[PDB]
Amino acid sequence: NPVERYVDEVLNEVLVVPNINQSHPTTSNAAPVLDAAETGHTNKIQPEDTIETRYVQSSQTLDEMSVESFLGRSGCIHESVLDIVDNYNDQSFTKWNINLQEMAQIRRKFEMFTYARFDSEITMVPSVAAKDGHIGHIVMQYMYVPPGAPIPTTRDDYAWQSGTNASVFWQHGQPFPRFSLPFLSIASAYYMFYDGYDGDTYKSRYGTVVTNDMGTLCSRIVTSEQLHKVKVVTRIYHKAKHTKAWCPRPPRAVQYSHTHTTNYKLSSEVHNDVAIRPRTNLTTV
Amino acid sequence: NPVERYVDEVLNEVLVVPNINQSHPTTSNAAPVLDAAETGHTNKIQPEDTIETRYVQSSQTLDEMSVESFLGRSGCIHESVLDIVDNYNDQSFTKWNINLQEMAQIRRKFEMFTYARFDSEITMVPSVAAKDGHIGHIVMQYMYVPPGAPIPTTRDDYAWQSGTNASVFWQHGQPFPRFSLPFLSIASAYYMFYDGYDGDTYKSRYGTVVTNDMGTLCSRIVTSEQLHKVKVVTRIYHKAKHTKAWCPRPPRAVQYSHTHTTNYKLSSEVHNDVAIRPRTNLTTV
Amino acid sequence: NPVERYVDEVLNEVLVVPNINQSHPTTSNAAPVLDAAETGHTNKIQPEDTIETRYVQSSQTLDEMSVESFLGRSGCIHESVLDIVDNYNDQSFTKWNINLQEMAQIRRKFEMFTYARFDSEITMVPSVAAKDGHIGHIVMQYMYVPPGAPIPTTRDDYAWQSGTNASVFWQHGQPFPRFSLPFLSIASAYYMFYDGYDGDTYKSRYGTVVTNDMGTLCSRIVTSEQLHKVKVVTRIYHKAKHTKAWCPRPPRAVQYSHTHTTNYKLSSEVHNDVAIRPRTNLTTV
Amino acid sequence: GLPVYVTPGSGQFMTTDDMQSPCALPWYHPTKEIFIPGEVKNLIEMCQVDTLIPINSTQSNIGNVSMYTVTLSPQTKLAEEIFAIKVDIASHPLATTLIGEIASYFTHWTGSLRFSFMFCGTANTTLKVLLAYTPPGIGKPRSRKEAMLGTHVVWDVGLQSTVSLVVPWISASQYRFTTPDTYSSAGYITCWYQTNFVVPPNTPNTAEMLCFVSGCKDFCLRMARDTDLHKQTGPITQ
Amino acid sequence: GLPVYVTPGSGQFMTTDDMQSPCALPWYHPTKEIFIPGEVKNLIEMCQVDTLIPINSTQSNIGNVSMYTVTLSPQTKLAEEIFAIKVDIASHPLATTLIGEIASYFTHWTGSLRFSFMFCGTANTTLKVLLAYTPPGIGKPRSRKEAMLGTHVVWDVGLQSTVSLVVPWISASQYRFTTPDTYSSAGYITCWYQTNFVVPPNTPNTAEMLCFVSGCKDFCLRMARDTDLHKQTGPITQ
Amino acid sequence: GLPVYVTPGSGQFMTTDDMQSPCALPWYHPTKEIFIPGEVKNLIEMCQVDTLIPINSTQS
Amino acid sequence: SDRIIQITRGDSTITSQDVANAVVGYGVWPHYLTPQDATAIDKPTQPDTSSNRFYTLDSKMWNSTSKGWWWKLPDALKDMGIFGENMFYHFLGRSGYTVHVQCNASKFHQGTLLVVMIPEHQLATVNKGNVNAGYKYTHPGEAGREVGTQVENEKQPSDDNWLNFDGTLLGNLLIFPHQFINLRSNNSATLIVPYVNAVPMDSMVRHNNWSLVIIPVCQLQSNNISNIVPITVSISPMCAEFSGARAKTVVQ
Amino acid sequence: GAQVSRQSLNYFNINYFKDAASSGASRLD
Amino acid sequence: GAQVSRQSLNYFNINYFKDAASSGASRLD
Amino acid sequence: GAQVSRQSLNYFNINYFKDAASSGASRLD
Amino acid sequence: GAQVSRQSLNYFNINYFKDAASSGASRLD
Amino acid sequence: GAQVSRQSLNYFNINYFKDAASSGASRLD
Ligand SMILES: Cc1cc(CCCOc2c(C)cc(-n3nnc(C)n3)cc2C)on1
Ligand SMILES: Cc1cc(CCCOc2c(C)cc(-n3nnc(C)n3)cc2C)on1
Ligand SMILES: Cc1cc(CCCOc2c(C)cc(-n3nnc(C)n3)cc2C)on1
Ligand SMILES: *C(=O)CCCCCCCCCCCCC
Ligand SMILES: *C(=O)CCCCCCCCCCCCC
Ligand SMILES: *C(=O)CCCCCCCCCCCCC
Ligand SMILES: *C(=O)CCCCCCCCCCCCC
Ligand SMILES: *C(=O)CCCCCCCCCCCCC
């Protein structure tokens, strides 16, 4: 019943955890506690098998641990800066090669899977700093330039006409812009990792940079030059919707250093590069 | 009938008080007025038992005296200050260890019960004071940091990315932010009082501080440094929704002095520390 | 079923592409690969006819390639400027002879057809530049003056009364104005091209200027003169809705030079005037 | 009134949004529609029509009809190469063909391509040519033997002037980028002499050949974008 | 129009809100989904798989595989302690195990834990060990006798290399904080020699043992939060 | 879109209003309720219990 | 007996009298590409028994100081009979595998190998900025890579076995299909993996789908160290199919 | 989430968000 | 202007203004 | 786009835009 | 709170808040 | 004030205020 299912959604009780059943003393030549990790399988032994348990009714749910929930939270993926210092025509616009690799927090989460397929919700948070006292009337234009489309080279470039590309215009004072994007890959899933090259020569590129080109985000302050200089910082937040993930992997253990690569740096004292805290010895808790 | 019940909701006539019935002179060896408070029970005698009453139709309702009503009013629980004086990077962000013990008004009400379970509605009222004349474009970020998550130590800390924590962004000019939170305890009810410790040594902590850790609220002015200095005060209002309370207790009789503790201070003239007004004598009304 | 059709709309699977079927070796005196382009028809040969294909299930859709989709994107068609320099009465209003020929991006797309019929959605993006520091209270008036109606000659002209013409008033701070217009021609379709004149003499006009008169757009800053000078730029965006197109034609290969005419300019080195990149020779890929 | 919650996105203007808006001309009744031949409903209709490939666009040929022709002639060396181009739909010289221009208004492409060739020599001129398609993952073939190992068609010139070679969709991913991208380069098409250009006496010793391109039933474009095959470097005035 | 009442909260952006928003790419049709082995639908699926505990992570061992092994050898004193650690899911050395890492993305935890141990000595090496779990409210056991009074398993090494000890959920509250908190510390796990490591002549006098951890059917995490087991101290560049 | 008329009162924050608001912790499942003796549902329950009157509250 | 196993593929049959069961990666058995998931439209070639057979790689020596070894598929098989030929003559390829690792010692030896199959094992470089592992280094062929021997070069990948050569901790490798060869229990490890990728078929020359990693987590010890204890790997493709035939690609 | 009652006096107890915490004050008793 | 369909999956193709030009993008084919 | 259920407790799973990407978080399992 | 009448000319006397004081002007007589 | 018609193409001629002057332009003839 879509209604009963509905109630489960409101209460977040879609995935319940099993109860613990009462168990009793045993004397048998069947030893569940014994197994062989060599097989590659995890011993499925449960509490009832090793101790005398009571009956307990579980009310915990796994809804919040779902992949949709894990990746369904908006996080920052880019901080775009437009700092008008001394040349409005040059400093009033910029561009960014889109990717989800510049901010560790969300990058690490997605990278816990090998492949993932999802729709995206983008929310933008622009903040105008009045460097000289006034901000006047700020209007912004965020244009998505898919790979191949002409990238504007000046604040009045014809490409800003956006005759086909999708552009979003925001007016200072109005609520934060937000829009959705469908799964964009030319493949069936996004590659979080890619053990391949774009060629077979010593100079061929390696990794996700070969497969994850998302194009460019071009921004510009639509308003023409004003007396008072401003610094506009637009933070882009991303959230995955209708998510699917495949082949889980270990979490990143060391800091990230670059985009599209698993490269890392190690100091002379490696224990400082990982979250593992040295133990005094084996018996010191 | 959900509709008849609905009408009762609109009219606030869900809980009616009983009528007074007509009574008559009596001469009996049954004396309701006499009892024994030693038992611990309150004598249930009513007006009809001690005087000759008339019949009166009651129209008073107890709806407003319900626990949901008593605690269902938004009150201030914190006043967060961000005063830009001489160092923007240091003064543009702060943190608060969440609790409902800093403001006497709502604290006293909740503390009339031993345990309570409820959902919370948080409403924020930010006010930007233009110390130097302009306020420019103010954008705020309120991030909830549950116990364990990394607390930002600088206004550009990576933790502000909010890859998982819930953050609320407010833009000056837009309506007051507001969101709901589900009952958060790891127990079945919140402890308003706790006669226990987190250990069994002379240095173990005592009281609700042991059980009521709600984490940290971290705020920051998203906007980068501006010419004109501002002072942003964000007042947090809390309201209990879908409330349940257990074991009522006496109301706080003296001023509060600290959070998570029933400690109090007494002056040399105690009658000044309590609301009791000295009587001239027993017969002076 | 309007509902099944609805699902196809949400999923964008209204126009599916055919599957590829398995094919086999052939030895026949029927040679599909051979034909005669002289006829003017394109040889309808498919992959299954020239190689041994496998069976493949197509999931590609042509929805996005529809004429409605191709022309249904809002693009800039005009940038109106009101720059208050030294004379408010003269510089606070202007006029534009409406046309879709001034911006190459959308012009080129419409011009891929000979005739087209559509409704229009106009969205305006005004941005006020505070040249002197303040913008005060800006209110704009955009009045559509159909051919024949009196064109205002001063900022207080009686024609601004808009007793019949449609006018749109925008208040700075409020969301971007937007309205729709029905197919406006006196003919059954708009002429994207017109091999005709408005007379039969050496001085008769040639081209779409004869048939595509849309009237004038007159703007003015309603607010009376203010201390601080501002520069208001209003960008007009146009989008075709409920579109129909006839007789496709080749795309514009050289830059546009003027409105209502296919005129172009050629340099001494023509290869620089077209997008064709010179080849080293026939066998150099 | 009805309590409402204004959601993020409100008040924004997205050029690709799909909302309704009041009509500025109420009561207005549009001109009646009449029948006009040639209605187009989908761009695919235009991608299915053959247009000429400016295959011979060397710097000296550009600006001349000869940029559209390939010259054939009696050879003194066997299996000589005639021409070679990339199969990538928006790469040169395919870029300015109708299908290349349309593909340039989209980010992704897929499907099979149809290449046609019309011989223009005399009715008495004979010739057998080999047209080959080399899937990616290898350089363009250096000889007919190398090319012949891939997909190909042996064209015998005769009563029927034209032949068609279909470049099947052989890709790892379902789609490819229309813009030049290593990962998605589609391969090459090369032409070689199978036998030789032969003519009787008193007959022109050279002949032209025309090349066309169009999409097959499975051709499809995706993700609309602005084209980079046309620009505006200044204002367009009256 | 319809009278409306704008409610508080309007226009705000909450990173965890769940609203709808217009699509920037109308009419776009996503690439067809294909079957890929290994789909994960819930993180619990990963918490149920055994991973190794870097139990021997002393400063000199970190950065070596040996940080994952415990060495056993013939004893000259009876009932000697082998190792001892806290049972707290996100405490060290459990922190970097897969289940510890995932738990670190949540504020609350509950359920029973499964600790496994694989002996790696020769096929001729014998040994009996006592694995014990000490519920909270008391210090870690100082002797085998003390430990043995709690929950425990006596492991006899033989044909089957591995044994599992289940740490039952014995708590006052239904959940515990994943971060170190006095009120919710879960207790300890200690290992002691039950008999002795015994080998025949000409056999290595020491042997390694591996330790795994995973969650039982009742394991569950709650209240998503950002992890403190990974950080970003600078920009990540191209 | 649907034409609307913003009414006075909009955007205000009344401490006694009764509106709904998005939940900051989606999918979160609260701890199961257990039985605790002494539940109170209405303050009248407390007004019906006898308490002592500090009737002899002279300053001394 | 549950300790015995016989695997027959094509003209090859392999046995082991001391196994620890077998592991089917992600529970999916290799299978041919279906028309619903296919994209390339030419008829594929399926060599069958001439390609889906066991190929034994170069043996390695396991000694007290070995740090580990790794091979990449299909790279490791690029020069193996018909399978190898097919992957170079065709643009596209698709295949699953049966991986059988062999290592016998004695009931007086001890040691433990962690055998793992990793999908998309994108190797890292250490302290070299944004310079990535060079093609040549991630394509060692049947020789595979002996961790801790290669004299460093700029495009040389990481050799940190405890960091999985990619910035993740070794103890969590168990989240990938794996098995252990614990000398006291078994003398072999068997893993059957299906084709895993975000595309139905791919270039076998530029994309390595699976990586076989072998790390000795428990040092090899005995009282007869002079006796060499090798490790041998035999891999059999399964349901191998190719498409996009042309001339043979020559690499380098 | 609409609890449509009928009596005509129709009641529409709508729950605009998918979490129980999101709803308003509780009904009594 | 409501084109209410039913299948339950009800469709509400509402036209908020009284002019045809006012409506959104057209359906296809 | 209204998925009207009935039980009376009526459910209104409305999809305000015509693209699937536009809708909110997915249902589980 | 919807007092849905029918005659079709349907009436929707909606009461948006749960207090009687909240409603508009009263009907007459 | 809802003049709900049906044909399904349902019409909703809603009158949001209680005065006749408040409604929009008149229908014709
Ligand atoms: C894997 C993977 C998936 C993605 C896509 C991320 C979405 O990227 C964007 C962003 C952040 C903004 C925009 N737009 N911003 N404004 C407009 C209009 N589009 C478009 C894309 C594709 O990137 N890597
Ligand atoms: C007993 C008891 C119950 C509570 C919880 C009070 C709610 O505390 C907050 C507050 C005031 C704000 C926030 N957030 N503020 N912004 C975001 C996002 N969350 C989160 C909590 C848990 O505290 N003590
Ligand atoms: C062909 C062809 C079709 C068109 C009509 C374009 C629409 O032109 C406008 C514009 C851009 C604005 C306005 N208005 N602006 N404000 C008001 C009111 N109307 C009216 C028209 C006809 O122009 N050429
Ligand atoms: C319940 O869980 C869904 C909440 C839906 C909110 C929309 C309510 C307004 C319904 C309008 C539809 C009118 C009937 C055709
Ligand atoms: C069509 O031409 C009329 C447009 C009406 C717009 C109002 C749509 C919302 C309907 C709400 C009524 C709920 C049913 C009682
Ligand atoms: C689905 O695809 C259409 C989305 C329609 C949005 C409008 C929902 C509100 C319905 C109000 C009508 C009331 C019933 C007369
Ligand atoms: C009455 O007490 C409840 C008030 C409910 C306000 C919502 C009214 C709008 C109803 C929209 C639902 C459309 C029918 C599916
Ligand atoms: C007529 O005089 C009353 C005007 C009522 C305005 C509200 C219209 C919207 C109806 C929403 C209810 C949905 C059906 C449950």
Short mmCIF file of C-alpha atoms in Angstrom, two decimals, chain G:
data_model
loop_
_atom_site.label_atom_id
_atom_site.label_comp_id
_atom_site.label_asym_id
_atom_site.label_seq_id
_atom_site.Cartn_x
_atom_site.Cartn_y
_atom_site.Cartn_z
CA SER G 1 35.76 -33.59 -0.32
CA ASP G 2 35.38 -29.82 0.27
CA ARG G 3 39.22 -29.46 0.25
CA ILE G 4 39.51 -30.59 -3.40
CA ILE G 5 38.80 -28.72 -6.63
CA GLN G 6 39.11 -29.31 -10.35
CA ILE G 7 38.70 -26.50 -12.84
CA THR G 8 38.46 -27.26 -16.53
CA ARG G 9 38.58 -24.54 -19.15
CA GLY G 10 39.15 -25.33 -22.81
CA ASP G 11 42.02 -27.82 -23.01
CA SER G 12 43.26 -27.05 -19.52
CA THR G 13 42.39 -28.71 -16.23
CA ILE G 14 43.70 -27.49 -12.90
CA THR G 15 43.57 -29.21 -9.51
CA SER G 16 44.26 -28.50 -5.85
CA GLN G 17 43.80 -30.87 -2.95
CA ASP G 18 43.82 -28.08 -0.37
CA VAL G 19 41.47 -25.26 -1.24
CA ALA G 20 39.55 -22.78 0.89
CA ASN G 21 36.44 -22.81 -1.29
CA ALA G 22 36.20 -20.35 -4.20
CA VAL G 23 35.04 -16.78 -4.53
CA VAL G 24 32.74 -15.44 -7.22
CA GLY G 25 33.29 -11.71 -7.37
CA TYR G 26 30.19 -9.78 -6.40
CA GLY G 27 28.25 -13.00 -6.76
CA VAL G 28 28.00 -12.64 -10.52
CA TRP G 29 29.16 -15.37 -12.88
CA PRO G 30 30.73 -14.17 -16.14
CA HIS G 31 28.36 -14.07 -19.11
CA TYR G 32 28.26 -12.79 -22.69
CA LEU G 33 27.00 -9.29 -23.46
CA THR G 34 23.25 -9.08 -24.01
CA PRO G 35 21.55 -7.02 -26.71
CA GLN G 36 19.93 -4.74 -24.12
CA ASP G 37 23.30 -3.68 -22.75
CA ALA G 38 25.29 -3.73 -26.00
CA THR G 39 26.21 -0.55 -27.86
CA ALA G 40 28.74 -1.51 -30.57
CA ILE G 41 26.69 -2.87 -33.48
CA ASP G 42 28.96 -5.31 -35.29
CA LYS G 43 28.71 -9.04 -34.63
CA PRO G 44 31.25 -9.99 -31.93
CA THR G 45 33.77 -12.79 -32.33
CA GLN G 46 33.82 -15.43 -29.60
CA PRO G 47 36.95 -17.63 -29.84
CA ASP G 48 35.53 -19.90 -27.14
CA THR G 49 37.85 -22.74 -26.10
CA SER G 50 40.86 -21.36 -27.93
CA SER G 51 40.86 -18.28 -25.73
CA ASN G 52 38.92 -19.25 -22.63
CA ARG G 53 41.63 -21.48 -21.21
CA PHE G 54 44.18 -21.31 -18.42
CA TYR G 55 47.35 -19.34 -19.10
CA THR G 56 50.15 -19.70 -16.56
CA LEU G 57 52.25 -16.60 -15.89
CA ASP G 58 55.88 -16.38 -14.82
CA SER G 59 56.38 -17.82 -11.35
CA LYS G 60 57.68 -15.62 -8.54
CA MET G 61 59.78 -16.38 -5.49
CA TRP G 62 58.42 -15.74 -2.03
CA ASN G 63 61.04 -15.00 0.60
CA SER G 64 61.12 -13.50 4.08
CA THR G 65 61.50 -10.01 2.67
CA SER G 66 59.02 -10.04 -0.22
CA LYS G 67 56.75 -7.02 -0.16
CA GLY G 68 54.19 -8.19 -2.69
CA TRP G 69 53.35 -8.47 -6.37
CA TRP G 70 50.64 -7.26 -8.71
CA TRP G 71 49.45 -7.85 -12.26
CA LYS G 72 46.80 -6.07 -14.28
CA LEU G 73 44.18 -7.63 -16.55
CA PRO G 74 43.89 -7.91 -19.47
CA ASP G 75 47.47 -6.61 -19.69
CA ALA G 76 49.06 -9.68 -18.10
CA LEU G 77 47.60 -11.81 -20.90
CA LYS G 78 48.44 -9.56 -23.85
CA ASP G 79 50.97 -12.03 -25.16
CA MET G 80 49.07 -15.24 -24.43
CA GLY G 81 48.01 -17.26 -27.46
CA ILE G 82 44.74 -16.51 -29.20
CA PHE G 83 43.44 -14.32 -26.38
CA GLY G 84 46.40 -12.00 -26.82
CA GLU G 85 46.08 -11.85 -30.59
CA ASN G 86 42.42 -11.00 -30.36
CA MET G 87 42.87 -8.13 -27.99
CA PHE G 88 45.24 -6.40 -30.41
CA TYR G 89 43.39 -7.03 -33.66
CA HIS G 90 40.17 -5.61 -32.19
CA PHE G 91 39.31 -2.20 -30.85
CA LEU G 92 36.85 -3.59 -28.31
CA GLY G 93 37.06 -6.54 -25.96
CA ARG G 94 35.12 -8.03 -23.05
CA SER G 95 35.97 -10.84 -20.65
CA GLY G 96 35.67 -12.42 -17.23
CA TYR G 97 38.33 -14.54 -15.51
CA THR G 98 39.09 -17.46 -13.28
CA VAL G 99 42.19 -16.65 -11.26
CA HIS G 100 43.99 -19.53 -9.64
CA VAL G 101 46.96 -18.68 -7.41
CA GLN G 102 49.22 -21.57 -6.44
CA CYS G 103 51.61 -21.84 -3.52
CA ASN G 104 52.50 -25.02 -1.66
CA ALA G 105 54.99 -25.36 1.20
CA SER G 106 54.92 -27.85 4.07
CA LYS G 107 53.21 -28.50 7.38
CA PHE G 108 56.25 -26.95 8.99
CA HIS G 109 56.15 -23.69 7.06
CA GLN G 110 53.98 -20.73 7.95
CA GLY G 111 53.00 -17.58 6.12
CA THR G 112 49.97 -15.84 4.70
CA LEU G 113 49.21 -14.23 1.37
CA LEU G 114 46.30 -11.87 0.85
CA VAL G 115 45.02 -12.37 -2.70
CA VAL G 116 42.82 -9.55 -4.01
CA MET G 117 41.05 -8.64 -7.22
CA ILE G 118 40.57 -4.88 -7.49
CA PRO G 119 38.33 -3.17 -10.06
CA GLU G 120 39.78 0.06 -11.50
CA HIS G 121 42.93 0.06 -9.37
CA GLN G 122 44.05 3.59 -10.25
CA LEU G 123 47.61 3.67 -8.97
CA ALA G 124 49.17 6.74 -7.38
CA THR G 125 52.61 8.33 -7.50
CA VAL G 126 54.20 9.53 -4.28
CA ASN G 127 55.64 13.00 -3.71
CA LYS G 128 55.67 13.76 -7.44
CA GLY G 129 52.98 16.40 -7.64
CA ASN G 130 50.32 15.81 -10.27
CA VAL G 131 52.52 13.51 -12.40
CA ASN G 132 50.69 10.21 -12.94
CA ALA G 133 51.82 6.61 -13.34
CA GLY G 134 53.14 6.09 -16.85
CA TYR G 135 51.57 3.72 -19.34
CA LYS G 136 54.67 1.55 -19.53
CA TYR G 137 54.71 1.01 -15.75
CA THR G 138 51.09 -0.06 -15.47
CA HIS G 139 51.53 -2.51 -18.34
CA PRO G 140 54.25 -4.92 -17.13
CA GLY G 141 52.62 -7.89 -18.86
CA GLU G 142 52.97 -11.43 -17.50
CA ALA G 143 56.03 -10.42 -15.47
CA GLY G 144 53.83 -8.24 -13.31
CA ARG G 145 55.44 -5.99 -10.74
CA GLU G 146 57.68 -7.05 -7.85
CA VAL G 147 56.96 -4.48 -5.18
CA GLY G 148 60.06 -2.83 -3.76
CA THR G 149 62.57 -3.58 -6.53
CA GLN G 150 62.07 -1.05 -9.34
CA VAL G 151 64.70 1.70 -9.24
CA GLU G 152 62.44 4.79 -9.02
CA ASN G 153 61.78 6.94 -12.12
CA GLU G 154 59.44 9.98 -12.34
CA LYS G 155 56.39 8.14 -13.75
CA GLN G 156 56.98 5.17 -11.46
CA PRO G 157 53.86 4.30 -9.40
CA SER G 158 53.74 4.01 -5.62
CA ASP G 159 55.29 0.93 -4.04
CA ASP G 160 53.65 1.41 -0.64
CA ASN G 161 51.89 -1.89 -0.05
CA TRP G 162 50.38 -0.71 3.24
CA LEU G 163 48.68 2.11 1.34
CA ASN G 164 47.42 -0.14 -1.45
CA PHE G 165 49.57 1.83 -3.88
CA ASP G 166 46.70 4.31 -4.00
CA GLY G 167 46.26 6.13 -0.70
CA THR G 168 43.97 3.70 1.11
CA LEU G 169 44.79 1.35 3.98
CA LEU G 170 45.70 -2.26 3.29
CA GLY G 171 43.46 -3.62 6.01
CA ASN G 172 40.39 -2.55 4.06
CA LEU G 173 41.30 -4.38 0.89
CA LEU G 174 39.00 -7.13 2.14
CA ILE G 175 36.07 -5.11 0.83
CA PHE G 176 37.13 -6.37 -2.61
CA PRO G 177 36.77 -9.99 -3.78
CA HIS G 178 39.63 -11.80 -2.05
CA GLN G 179 40.96 -14.94 -0.43
CA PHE G 180 43.91 -15.85 1.75
CA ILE G 181 46.51 -18.51 1.20
CA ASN G 182 47.40 -19.42 4.77
CA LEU G 183 50.04 -22.10 4.39
CA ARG G 184 48.64 -24.06 7.33
CA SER G 185 45.22 -24.35 5.66
CA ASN G 186 45.41 -24.15 1.87
CA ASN G 187 47.84 -24.25 -1.02
CA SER G 188 45.79 -22.24 -3.51
CA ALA G 189 43.24 -19.48 -4.00
CA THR G 190 40.52 -19.36 -6.63
CA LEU G 191 38.58 -16.29 -7.71
CA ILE G 192 36.07 -16.06 -10.54
CA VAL G 193 35.28 -12.51 -11.59
CA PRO G 194 32.72 -11.17 -14.05
CA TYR G 195 33.27 -8.25 -16.39
CA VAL G 196 32.89 -4.99 -14.45
CA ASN G 197 32.81 -1.62 -16.20
CA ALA G 198 30.70 1.49 -16.84
CA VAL G 199 30.59 0.52 -20.55
CA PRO G 200 29.61 -2.88 -22.10
CA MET G 201 32.93 -3.35 -23.88
CA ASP G 202 36.18 -1.44 -23.85
CA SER G 203 39.67 -1.10 -25.27
CA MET G 204 41.81 -3.81 -23.73
CA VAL G 205 44.92 -1.95 -24.76
CA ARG G 206 44.25 1.26 -22.82
CA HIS G 207 41.99 0.15 -20.00
CA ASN G 208 42.92 -2.43 -17.37
CA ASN G 209 39.71 -3.55 -15.68
CA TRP G 210 41.00 -5.74 -12.88
CA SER G 211 44.20 -5.76 -10.84
CA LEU G 212 45.46 -8.86 -9.07
CA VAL G 213 47.31 -7.94 -5.92
CA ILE G 214 49.18 -10.39 -3.72
CA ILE G 215 50.57 -9.18 -0.41
CA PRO G 216 52.30 -11.41 2.10
CA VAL G 217 50.69 -10.23 5.35
CA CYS G 218 52.38 -12.93 7.39
CA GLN G 219 56.05 -13.39 6.64
CA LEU G 220 57.15 -16.74 5.25
CA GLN G 221 59.01 -18.72 7.90
CA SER G 222 60.38 -22.23 8.34
CA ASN G 223 63.48 -24.09 9.46
CA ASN G 224 64.45 -25.05 5.94
CA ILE G 225 64.77 -21.69 4.23
CA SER G 226 67.01 -23.02 1.45
CA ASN G 227 63.95 -24.67 -0.14
CA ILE G 228 62.52 -22.14 -2.56
CA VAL G 229 58.79 -21.48 -2.23
CA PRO G 230 57.43 -20.01 -5.49
CA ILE G 231 54.05 -18.49 -6.25
CA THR G 232 52.42 -19.34 -9.55
CA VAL G 233 49.42 -17.69 -11.17
CA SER G 234 47.16 -19.26 -13.78
CA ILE G 235 44.42 -17.15 -15.34
CA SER G 236 41.66 -18.23 -17.66
CA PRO G 237 39.51 -15.75 -19.56
CA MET G 238 35.78 -16.53 -19.59
CA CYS G 239 33.23 -15.52 -22.20
CA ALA G 240 35.84 -13.52 -24.04
CA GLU G 241 34.39 -11.65 -26.99
CA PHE G 242 35.80 -8.99 -29.28
CA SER G 243 34.48 -6.46 -31.76
CA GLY G 244 35.80 -3.84 -34.16
CA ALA G 245 38.27 -5.89 -36.17
CA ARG G 246 41.12 -4.23 -38.09
CA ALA G 247 44.90 -4.50 -38.36
CA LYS G 248 46.92 -5.52 -35.30
CA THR G 249 47.72 -2.73 -32.86
CA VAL G 250 51.41 -2.51 -32.03
CA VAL G 251 52.24 -0.83 -28.75
CA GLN G 252 55.23 1.38 -27.93
#
